[PDB]
Design a protein around this ligand. Structure first.
Ligand SMILES: [Mg+2]
Ligand SMILES: [Mg+2]
Ligand SMILES: [Zn+2]
Lengths: 52, 153, 71, 190, 71, 196
RNA sequence: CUCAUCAGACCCCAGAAAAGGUGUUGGUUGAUAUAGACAGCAGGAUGGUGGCCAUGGAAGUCGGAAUCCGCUAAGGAGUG
RNA sequence: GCCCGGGG
């Protein structure tokens, strides 16, 4: 399939993210506030959901 | 040839499935008796899953008994065994004595990663009330005996 | 349980219109007396605890109440 | 609060000849020369010590948004110093599931031809930024190496390759194929 | 059913209690005004926190029950 | 509680000062936990090693500015992962017990070996597997008859050179260690005299 | 003081709220700090214990009740 | 002033 050394590399830019609940922005994994002005830089963040 | 390897049995009561085979099976000696081949010279346990690291010879095993402290203070005052029923109030009840403190704090001297036995008559006593047995009371009576007045090597 | 009180009233705030403050009171529970003076004035038998709150005992009744309190 | 002075100094090695014409920085090393301009910031750039040992950055009378631009200049000049001494090497790896990603490098290392990214007949042509060498690394199956002196062109070119090999209209957490920056180091180690 | 609370937020009218002049008044949504250990003594629960209003406004009984359920 | 344990750590330094007016300033990073318990339990009457923050003991010199005038020349010496040894017995017996106090641990991926490290040429006893990580620079491997046989001795680590990640992982799957855990000395202070 | 990729701009008055913001500025309260802190970079994570009770087996690493000791700089019968 | 540190 894909070796896990490459799979962690792909998952780093594809799903190791935090998502703003208000504006669905794809944020860096250590984000506390969203970067977009449209959500008022809100702190309502959830982890990006993982595939099963 | 002398062998040393980790081992986990049920002790004396009959189990359903062996817990010894995936390492000591290809070791040449009999992997069949090991459900109670660690019960050669128990004497006291007879119903408890005892954790043993012993010395293994190429024909059959050799007597080396290293207990739990929980097992050591369960078998300070002996409780009767039970079968696979395993009913409630099998937690240990019975007042441990100072004699049963200082007889099996000697099993804490010969591991020798501690203080002297003065430090371990608190160690096995701190195991004692966790496993459910007391020396004339719980810790606000045990530490009363232990301060300046605990008999010791 | 102070932070639990503050978060409970802060959550209950959203059910209410307008602006509400959360204020930790100076008093002792649901009483009119200050929490600092409360315990020694219980000790001096100025407040007798009576269920949820207290009853104030002034120096003004008949002396048979004082004897019953100081027996 | 207007802080009266925010300063930070950067130590400059023996190997590097540095110069300044106001708020442009001209760093010279073994690998070439880097100019970067900073007239958008309004700082004091001092070049102190004879033989030009320390580059010092001053911001006088700045609020927080102006104080934050001192260490940014120092980190940019440091990145230019490591660009002319040690270079920048961005090592990208080409993750695929079923369709092998075929990468052909053209024009001395200045154009990438990406083919069979997820079984597409469309060929992606990625032109490099000027001065960035692009190369397929030996002793590794699916890897690509970007080498240069400007970090902001090397990493932008890596971003161009990465955003050119993007999966569309599927679930990207399952369709993980693409060419991704895996290692960030220098051309010449130390 | 019932109007939003912005229709009756402000204390515009005179006070109008239920009495022999106001009949056919439905019961309030809030009925219980005390929750938790009502039977707790005065020395068991010393710390008191208030939700204090900051406006001359009108709080509905529905809101007074919703906030006590939330708290 | 901690507000008296600060001055109680100071008073533990005082307990060592009130028995022993000479210092073996040991600089020992990454030492083992149970073997350091054994360090306390070995020469327990005559020496013990304490662990802690170097700047408090350098402030304790100015705390003893003129009540312990021996330790005044011990301020600009303390650099590194430093413990204190306080002894009365000699310069020989405690030192050559601390010299051989050793324990092995697998080759660290990110640390250094201070001498010239060799490779054990023997069999491993396990069958066919991947190979080229040992030929990453050219060192030969002769896989035959199941067991993994090495031809000769081309040495691992040169003195003054680091031990990287891949080559340490090679020895981590091989259970080979360069040297053991050492309680290495930096500088000593003997009874009002500073040597190395 | 404030930057608005919806700025703001003067009684009546001519358009906005709850809620929210690591935008930026101030202030209040409490700690945790030169008996040297906070990041960051490394190192140790110990024996009693592989814990009675359940569960086939769970040994700090599914669960509920036990949550003491000592050598200690430290380590919860252990956050994943 | 004296001590430490580095820049001429
Ligand atoms: Mg679809
Ligand atoms: Mg009206
Ligand atoms: Zn957002």
């Amino acid at each position: 399939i894909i070796e896990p050394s490459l799979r962690q590399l792909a998952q780093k830019y594809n799903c190791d993210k935090m998502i703003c609940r208000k504006c669905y922005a794809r944020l860096h994994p250590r984000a506390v506030n969203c970067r977009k002005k449209k959500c008022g830089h809100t702190n309502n963040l959830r982890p990006k959901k993982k595939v099963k | 040839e002398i062998k040393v390897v980790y081992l986990r049995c049920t002790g004396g009561e009959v189990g359903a499935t062996s817990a010894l085979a995936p390492k000591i099976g290809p070791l040449g000696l009999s992997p069949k008796k090991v459900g109670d081949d660690i019960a050669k010279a128990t004497g006291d346990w007879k119903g408890l899953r005892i954790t043993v690291k012993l010395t293994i010879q190429n024909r059959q095993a050799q007597i080396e008994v290293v207990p739990s402290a929980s097992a050591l203070i369960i078998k300070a005052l002996k409780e009767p065994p039970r079968d696979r029923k395993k009913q409630k109030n099998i937690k240990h009840s019975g007042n441990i004595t100072f004699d049963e403190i200082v007889n099996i704090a000697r099993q804490m001297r010969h591991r020798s990663l501690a203080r002297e036995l003065s430090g371990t008559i608190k160690e096995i006593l701190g195991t004692a009330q966790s496993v459910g047995c007391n020396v004339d009371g719980r810790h606000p009576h045990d530490i009363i005996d232990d301060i300046n007045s605990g008999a010791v090597e | 349980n102070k932070e639990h009180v503050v978060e409970a009233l802060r959550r209950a705030k959203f059910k209410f219109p307008g602006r509400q403050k959360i204020h930790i009171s100076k008093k002792w529970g649901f009483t009119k007396f200050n929490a600092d003076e409360f315990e020694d004035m219980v000790a001096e038998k100025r407040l007798i605890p009576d269920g949820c709150g207290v009853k104030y005992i002034p120096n003004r009744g008949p002396l048979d109440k004082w004897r019953a309190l100081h027996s | 609060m207007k802080t009266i002075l925010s300063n930070q100094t950067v130590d400059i090695p023996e190997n590097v000849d540095i110069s300044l014409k106001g708020r442009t920085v001209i760093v010279k090393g073994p690998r070439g020369t880097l100019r970067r301009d900073f007239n958008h910031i309004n700082v004091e750039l001092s070049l102190l010590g004879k033989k030009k040992k320390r580059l010092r950055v001053d911001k006088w009378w700045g609020n927080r948004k102006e104080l934050a631009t001192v260490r940014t200049i120092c980190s940019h000049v440091q990145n230019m110093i490591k660009g002319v001494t040690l270079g920048f090497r961005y090592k990208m790896r080409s993750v695929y599931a079923h369709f092998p990603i075929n990468v052909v490098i053209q024009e001395n290392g200045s154009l990438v031809e990406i083919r069979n990214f997820l079984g597409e007949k469309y060929i992606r042509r990625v032109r490099m930024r000027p001065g960035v060498a692009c190369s397929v690394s030996q002793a590794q199956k699916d890897e690509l190496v970007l080498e240069g002196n400007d970090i902001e062109l090397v990493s932008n070119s890596a971003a161009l390759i990465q955003q050119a090999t993007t999966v569309k209209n599927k679930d990207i957490r399952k369709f993980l194929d693409g060419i991704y920056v895996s290692e960030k180091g220098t051309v010449q180690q130390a | 059913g019932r109007r939003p609370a912005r229709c009756y937020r402000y204390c515009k009218n005179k006070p109008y209690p239920k009495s022999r002049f106001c009949r056919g008044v439905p019961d309030a949504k809030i009925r219980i005004f005390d929750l938790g250990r009502k039977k707790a003594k005065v020395d068991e629960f010393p710390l008191c926190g208030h939700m204090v209003s900051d406006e001359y406004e009108q709080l509905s009984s529905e809101a007074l029950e919703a906030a006590r359920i939330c708290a | 509680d901690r507000a008296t344990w600060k001055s109680n750590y100071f008073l533990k330094i005082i307990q060592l000062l009130d028995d022993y007016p000479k210092c073996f300033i040991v600089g020992a990073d990454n030492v083992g936990s149970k073997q350091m318990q054994q360090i306390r339990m070995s020469l327990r009457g005559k020496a013990v090693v304490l662990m802690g923050k170097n700047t408090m003991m350098r402030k304790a010199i100015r705390g003893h500015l003129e009540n312990n005038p021996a330790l005044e020349k011990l301020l600009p010496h303390i650099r590194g992962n430093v413990g204190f040894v306080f002894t009365k017995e000699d310069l020989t017996e405690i030192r050559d017990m601390l010299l051989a106090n050793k324990v092995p641990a697998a080759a660290r991926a990110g640390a250094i070996a201070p001498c010239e490290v060799t490779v054990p040429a023997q069999n491993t006893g396990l069958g066919p597997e991947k190979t080229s990580f040992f030929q990453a620079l050219g060192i030969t491997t002769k896989i035959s008859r199941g067991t993994i046989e090495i031809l000769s001795d081309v040495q691992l680590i040169k003195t003054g050179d680091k031990v990287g990640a891949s080559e340490a992982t090679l020895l981590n799957m091989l259970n080979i260690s360069p040297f053991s855990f050492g309680l290495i000395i930096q500088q000593v202070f003997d009874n009002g005299s500073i040597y190395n």
